């Protein structure tokens, strides 16, 4: 069911934060553990700020905190080009339950279209289920990221789900879960943007995990 997939997502969601060495942590969004010490996280969380590699990354797993130099996480792309969401290996994180087999197969994408879905996410650790209206797939999606200083960047990704719904700051990194029980309520991807009552998630397929 949607709710049981949601429980598996919930248990693998951590809070992602960034800070300078010896400084306060800025808690930005969610990251989703997928297998071993690998997580999915929107790279817009960190990549557009100055000297990101000299920062410390923080992972909050239910009130237990894990930190690491940004230079010591291994970042792997989902596909060619910029997809925002990346795979990130964090050596200091406790091993995750392998949830990769719960993600949609590329070939099954059409089966999630025109059906409801649920965004399974948090706002700074408080779990939320956000209803999304019948889904469409945009071959290219563009959204605006506001950086810490106030300036903005336009981001464009390939293959992003679009659904009617109401989101809040901090919900990025949560997982979109299909209502379609015939594909075992597959995880469809990772929430990256929202506005004007529309929610956008980058497609993440099972096949993408072959990038190790």
């Amino acid at each position: 069911s949607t709710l049981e997939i949601a429980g598996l997502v919930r248990k693998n969601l951590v809070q992602f934060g960034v800070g300078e060495k010896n400084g306060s942590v800025r808690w930005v969004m969610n990251a989703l553990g997928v297998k071993d010490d690998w997580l999915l996280v929107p790279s817009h969380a960190y990549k557009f700020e100055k000297d990101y590699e000299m920062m410390e990354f923080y992972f909050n797993r239910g009130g237990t905190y894990y930190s690491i130099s940004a230079g010591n996480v291994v970042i792997q792309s989902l596909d060619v080009g910029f997809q925002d969401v990346v795979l990130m290996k964090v050596p200091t994180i406790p091993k995750f339950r392998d949830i990769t087999q719960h993600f949609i197969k590329k070939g099954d994408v059409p089966r999630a279209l025109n059906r409801l879905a649920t965004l399974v996410t948090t706002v700074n650790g408080t779990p939320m289920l956000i209803s999304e209206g019948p889904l469409k797939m945009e071959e290219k999606a563009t959204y605006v990221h506001k950086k810490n200083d106030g300036t903005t960047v336009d981001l464009t990704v390939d293959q992003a789900w679009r659904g009617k719904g109401e989101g809040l700051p901090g919900m990025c990194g949560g997982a979109l879960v299909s209502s379609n029980q015939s594909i075992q309520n597959a995880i469809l991807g990772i929430h990256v943007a929202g506005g004007n009552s529309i929610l956008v998630a980058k497609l993440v397929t099972q096949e993408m995990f072959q990038n190790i």
């Binding site: 990221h145 990025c172 990256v192 943007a193």
Partner: peptide, 4 residues
């Protein structure tokens, strides 16, 4: 759309 804004990055959330």
């Amino acid at each position: 759309l804004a990055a959330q």
